[PDB]
Design a protein around this ligand. Sequence first.
Ligand SMILES: [Mg+2]
Ligand SMILES: [Mg+2]
Ligand SMILES: [Mg+2]
Ligand SMILES: [Mg+2]
Ligand SMILES: [Mg+2]
Ligand SMILES: [Mg+2]
Ligand SMILES: [Mg+2]
Ligand SMILES: [Mg+2]
Ligand SMILES: [Mg+2]
Ligand SMILES: [Mg+2]
Ligand SMILES: [Mg+2]
Ligand SMILES: [Mg+2]
Ligand SMILES: [Mg+2]
Ligand SMILES: [Mg+2]
Ligand SMILES: [Mg+2]
Ligand SMILES: [Mg+2]
Ligand SMILES: [Mg+2]
Ligand SMILES: [Mg+2]
Ligand SMILES: [Mg+2]
Ligand SMILES: [Mg+2]
Ligand SMILES: [Mg+2]
Ligand SMILES: [Mg+2]
Ligand SMILES: [Mg+2]
Ligand SMILES: [Mg+2]
Ligand SMILES: [Mg+2]
Ligand SMILES: [Mg+2]
Ligand SMILES: [Mg+2]
Ligand SMILES: [Mg+2]
Ligand SMILES: [Mg+2]
Ligand SMILES: [Mg+2]
Ligand SMILES: [Mg+2]
Ligand SMILES: [Mg+2]
Ligand SMILES: [Mg+2]
Ligand SMILES: [Mg+2]
Ligand SMILES: [Mg+2]
Ligand SMILES: [Mg+2]
Ligand SMILES: [Mg+2]
Ligand SMILES: [Mg+2]
Ligand SMILES: [Mg+2]
Ligand SMILES: [Mg+2]
Ligand SMILES: [Mg+2]
Ligand SMILES: [Mg+2]
Ligand SMILES: [Mg+2]
Ligand SMILES: [Mg+2]
Ligand SMILES: [Mg+2]
Ligand SMILES: [Mg+2]
Ligand SMILES: [Mg+2]
Ligand SMILES: [Mg+2]
Ligand SMILES: [Mg+2]
Ligand SMILES: [Mg+2]
Ligand SMILES: [Mg+2]
Ligand SMILES: [Mg+2]
Ligand SMILES: [Mg+2]
Lengths: 104, 55, 72, 134
Amino acid sequence: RRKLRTRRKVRTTTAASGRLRLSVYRSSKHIYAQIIDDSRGQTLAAASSAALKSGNKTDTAAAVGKALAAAAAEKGIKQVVFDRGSYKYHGRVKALADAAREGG
Amino acid sequence: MKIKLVRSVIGRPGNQVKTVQALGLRKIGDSREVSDTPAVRGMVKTVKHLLEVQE
Amino acid sequence: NGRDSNPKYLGVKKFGGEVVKAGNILVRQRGTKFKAGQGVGMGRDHTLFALSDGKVVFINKGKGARFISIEA
Amino acid sequence: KRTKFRKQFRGRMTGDAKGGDYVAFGDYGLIAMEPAWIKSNQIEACRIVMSRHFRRGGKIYIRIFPDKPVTKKPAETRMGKGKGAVEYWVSVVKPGRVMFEVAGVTEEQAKEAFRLAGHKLPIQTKMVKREVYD
RNA sequence: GACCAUGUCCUGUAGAGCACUCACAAGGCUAAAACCUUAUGAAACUCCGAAGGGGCACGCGUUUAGUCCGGGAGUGAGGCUGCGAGAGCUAACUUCCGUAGCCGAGAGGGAAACAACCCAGACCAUCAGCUAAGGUCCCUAAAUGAUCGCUCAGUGGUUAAGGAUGUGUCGUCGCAUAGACAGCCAGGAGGUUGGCUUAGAAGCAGCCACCCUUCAAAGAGUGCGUAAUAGCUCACUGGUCGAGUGACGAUGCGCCGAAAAUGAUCGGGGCUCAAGUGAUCUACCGAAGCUAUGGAUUCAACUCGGAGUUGUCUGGUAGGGGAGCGUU
RNA sequence: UAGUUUGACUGGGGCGGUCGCCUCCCAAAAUGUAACGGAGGCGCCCAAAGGUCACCUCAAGACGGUUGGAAAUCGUCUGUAGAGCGCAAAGGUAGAAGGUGGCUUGACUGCGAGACUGACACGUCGAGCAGGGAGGAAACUCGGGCUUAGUGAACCGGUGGUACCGUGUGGAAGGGCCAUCGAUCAACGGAUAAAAGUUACCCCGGGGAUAACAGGCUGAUCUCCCCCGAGAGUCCAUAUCGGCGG
RNA sequence: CACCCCCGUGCCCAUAGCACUGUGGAACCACCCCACCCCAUGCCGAACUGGGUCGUGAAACACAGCAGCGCCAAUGAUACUCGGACCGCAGGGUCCCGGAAAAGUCGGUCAGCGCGGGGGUU
Ligand SMILES: [Mg+2]
Ligand SMILES: [Mg+2]
Ligand SMILES: [Mg+2]
Ligand SMILES: [Mg+2]
Ligand SMILES: [Mg+2]
Ligand SMILES: [Mg+2]
Ligand SMILES: [Mg+2]
Ligand SMILES: [Mg+2]
Ligand SMILES: [Mg+2]
Ligand SMILES: [Mg+2]
Ligand SMILES: [Mg+2]
Ligand SMILES: [Mg+2]
Ligand SMILES: [Mg+2]
Ligand SMILES: [Mg+2]
Ligand SMILES: [Mg+2]
Ligand SMILES: [Mg+2]
Ligand SMILES: [Mg+2]
Ligand SMILES: [Mg+2]
Ligand SMILES: [Mg+2]
Ligand SMILES: [Mg+2]
Ligand SMILES: [Mg+2]
Ligand SMILES: [Mg+2]
Ligand SMILES: [Mg+2]
Ligand SMILES: [Mg+2]
Ligand SMILES: [Mg+2]
Ligand SMILES: [Mg+2]
Ligand SMILES: [Mg+2]
Ligand SMILES: [Mg+2]
Ligand SMILES: [Mg+2]
Ligand SMILES: [Mg+2]
Ligand SMILES: [Mg+2]
Ligand SMILES: [Mg+2]
Ligand SMILES: [Mg+2]
Ligand SMILES: [Mg+2]
Ligand SMILES: [Mg+2]
Ligand SMILES: [Mg+2]
Ligand SMILES: [Mg+2]
Ligand SMILES: [Mg+2]
Ligand SMILES: [Mg+2]
Ligand SMILES: [Mg+2]
Ligand SMILES: [Mg+2]
Ligand SMILES: [Mg+2]
Ligand SMILES: [Mg+2]
Ligand SMILES: [Mg+2]
Ligand SMILES: [Mg+2]
Ligand SMILES: [Mg+2]
Ligand SMILES: [Mg+2]
Ligand SMILES: [Mg+2]
Ligand SMILES: [Mg+2]
Ligand SMILES: [Mg+2]
Ligand SMILES: [Mg+2]
Ligand SMILES: [Mg+2]
Ligand SMILES: [Mg+2]
């Protein structure tokens, strides 16, 4: 089964560290990748791909990361924890991290 | 509440002995008035078999 | 027979409603009979000691789901 | 009555019965009045005598069973070393716990069957007929 | 500090349950493991799970202890009882732990007597008073007390399995002024000297099975009988008979069961014409406990330059401390 | 010839057994708690069974299947676990501690706030700081192993560093310190470096703290009685005898 | 929190889960789609994974009905027990006061609260 995600999301015990976590959903390339402060039941920085276009999924993903980096920097955030989903750090998601911390 | 010792403390388990002592009757035939406060009302229920509760 | 082994005075060393210094030991256990909540960190033999000074509180739905947090 | 394999030894105590206060299976039955151990052999004698009264019968459940070993110390020995090895098995029998339960035999026949089956027993007992049963 | 109350947390015992492990009770199902209905035990089994118990905090309440630091010790053989376990034989004035209390270190009243049990912790003095346990017939202090019973056994004043038309209190089942239980006369039947048996077994050794006729009236039918039938009785029938009976049951008090060694006994006398008993209620006796008057110490406050007042305290072994008396 | 050694517990001594550490029950729902009480393990292992990063999910059953068939192996369905965890068990564990690879050694040096535990002495856990490493993209995790056994103070010495003492001064001999090695000293807090019997020729000092006798308490065993009643007694349980049980 | 609905991520922590089942469709999600290479399978693009439309709501998933199952679960009555006070030689047991389960019945539920976004009534 997909015991990848409960495992990786129990390994964010370091939400006790105070950093926010950055969920990603390499599914339909919907890769919405929310930023969450877990303590409240609250999310703070959405970046859904509704009509961003940008072409092939591996590069639209980096576009989603570079746009969300601004979308969260507006509110005043910089500590980061990359709560990957079940997905590997394989590239199409790795571009999201590269472009996200390229412009925190 | 009126209280009077009419039982010896001898030979009775030591919680009852420190209970009568803090009640402040050190000898049988002692009496005293007492507050209605639940703390002391339970202090007297604990050793009611030693005392004559009057009120 | 006639053999036996030393006591290991294990337990809930600090009960909920007890202020604790950092590094106080609060539960002793063979394993994770307690699973350590926020502020607490669990050692090698799975004793869990508070990291932060404050009150001790028990999260406890039970059945292996009992956790010890500390509130400042 | 003997238990085919176990762990070796036990202990003892008593308080009133919580398993088998009501009869099933049979027509009539018999109940303890006194707490006690009962040996395998006391059972087997009740079986022998109630099978004497029940020729070609087959209505003899034995709703009790020697579970507990009890181990006397050997010949003449001063104390020291274990409980020897088990000398006989016994069944705890607290009051109100049924022992016996017949069917298919008329009231006075079961009544005599229970007379003899109790007289070999080390306890008071009583015959009962079933009706206040859920 | 200590007890007690509130708040909170932690626990896996009693109990209780089979959901796992071992065990185990009657069946159905089936190449029997498995499975289902039903049924159970478990120190090393737990789906559960109190009472209590421990830590914290408060004191929202009565009390007086505690903590550390320095001098001196002794003790490191425990004993019983009750509760909870182990070991034992559910033995022991047994042995080993937990726990409470007494004894050790404890006087006084009770238990005839008696470290441990029940009452009650002795500062001193009194020819003063109330009580505790326990008592009130004489010994022997104090009701031959009162009221409803219970037991006629000296039970009381030594056990049990088991028996008993012993006796009260309720209580369940039948058949009766269309007249029953014992109780007297009257009948005892039919194939049938019934199948199944050993050598004969024929109400009436005994394994297997009980229907059918003639009847106001009787079961191929009870215990006896010689080895078999008769034989006197019985279960239904009847003139009489004239009113209750018989059954298992719960129980209260008793009987038997119930033999040991120098001489008997409840402590003794004696007790039912209660001095036994269960239920109630008083009235008094009854301690070195409590109260009264007097008296002195330990401590502490309170006053004057140990004294005195008020409170309080004063059983005591090893021991620690303190004030003093006697001899050279 | 001589001076000595020759262990303790022990329902009396001897014999047998035991002596240290771990697990469970006893242990009476805190911690603790005895027994020659009931059960069983340890005197090690692992260059990866570590650190880290990443990835898989186990028994067992049924239907189906090649030489195998109750159980090799593959295939489907059910499958909070009925498996596994190096050895014993309890706890624990399914988001892993179980299984499988890549990298490397934190199986580091210097420290230790705070506590748990113990009469001590030992023992346990431990956040975070330095120097510097290792894995990861990072958060982060590493100063051994899921945990609890795998162990012995102190003395006297071996080996490598270091440059403190080193006797008049300079050196060296020797010593100190840091590291490490030598222990069934297992009677496992460990009397010496170095040790067995025997006494009925016995002697002393003690003990009813403790056996042989006798009394006592108990009454398993012993002696006796009673209940039942199977059968024996042709017949008929009880004239006698009375199984198995109480 | 205008009304629904979807993707995700929390709190909760079986009264939320199972099964039977019906709705769902290019809006969302999901399989199918191809593989020399990023990247990978101790064999397989099944899994990760990279390049995408059709197709299809089949399967999975979401959401409703659903009391066969599970899950919860009284009251009442006990068991037991703190203190008090008793009987039995003994195993054992009783009484007064107060605390009081477990099992079972009665009955309850196929949940309940957020946060961000996506597309709807245009
Ligand atoms: Mg018990
Ligand atoms: Mg039951
Ligand atoms: Mg043994
Ligand atoms: Mg206080
Ligand atoms: Mg039990
Ligand atoms: Mg306790
Ligand atoms: Mg305060
Ligand atoms: Mg001192
Ligand atoms: Mg001693
Ligand atoms: Mg003792
Ligand atoms: Mg025994
Ligand atoms: Mg003794
Ligand atoms: Mg002794
Ligand atoms: Mg003494
Ligand atoms: Mg004393
Ligand atoms: Mg006395
Ligand atoms: Mg006496
Ligand atoms: Mg006298
Ligand atoms: Mg004496
Ligand atoms: Mg004396
Ligand atoms: Mg005595
Ligand atoms: Mg008394
Ligand atoms: Mg008087
Ligand atoms: Mg009186
Ligand atoms: Mg007189
Ligand atoms: Mg009797
Ligand atoms: Mg009179
Ligand atoms: Mg009077
Ligand atoms: Mg007097
Ligand atoms: Mg006096
Ligand atoms: Mg005076
Ligand atoms: Mg004194
Ligand atoms: Mg005094
Ligand atoms: Mg004195
Ligand atoms: Mg010796
Ligand atoms: Mg304990
Ligand atoms: Mg002791
Ligand atoms: Mg791991
Ligand atoms: Mg650290
Ligand atoms: Mg570092
Ligand atoms: Mg790196
Ligand atoms: Mg050297
Ligand atoms: Mg030596
Ligand atoms: Mg030693
Ligand atoms: Mg000589
Ligand atoms: Mg002497
Ligand atoms: Mg002696
Ligand atoms: Mg002797
Ligand atoms: Mg002899
Ligand atoms: Mg109730
Ligand atoms: Mg009470
Ligand atoms: Mg009690
Ligand atoms: Mg009650």
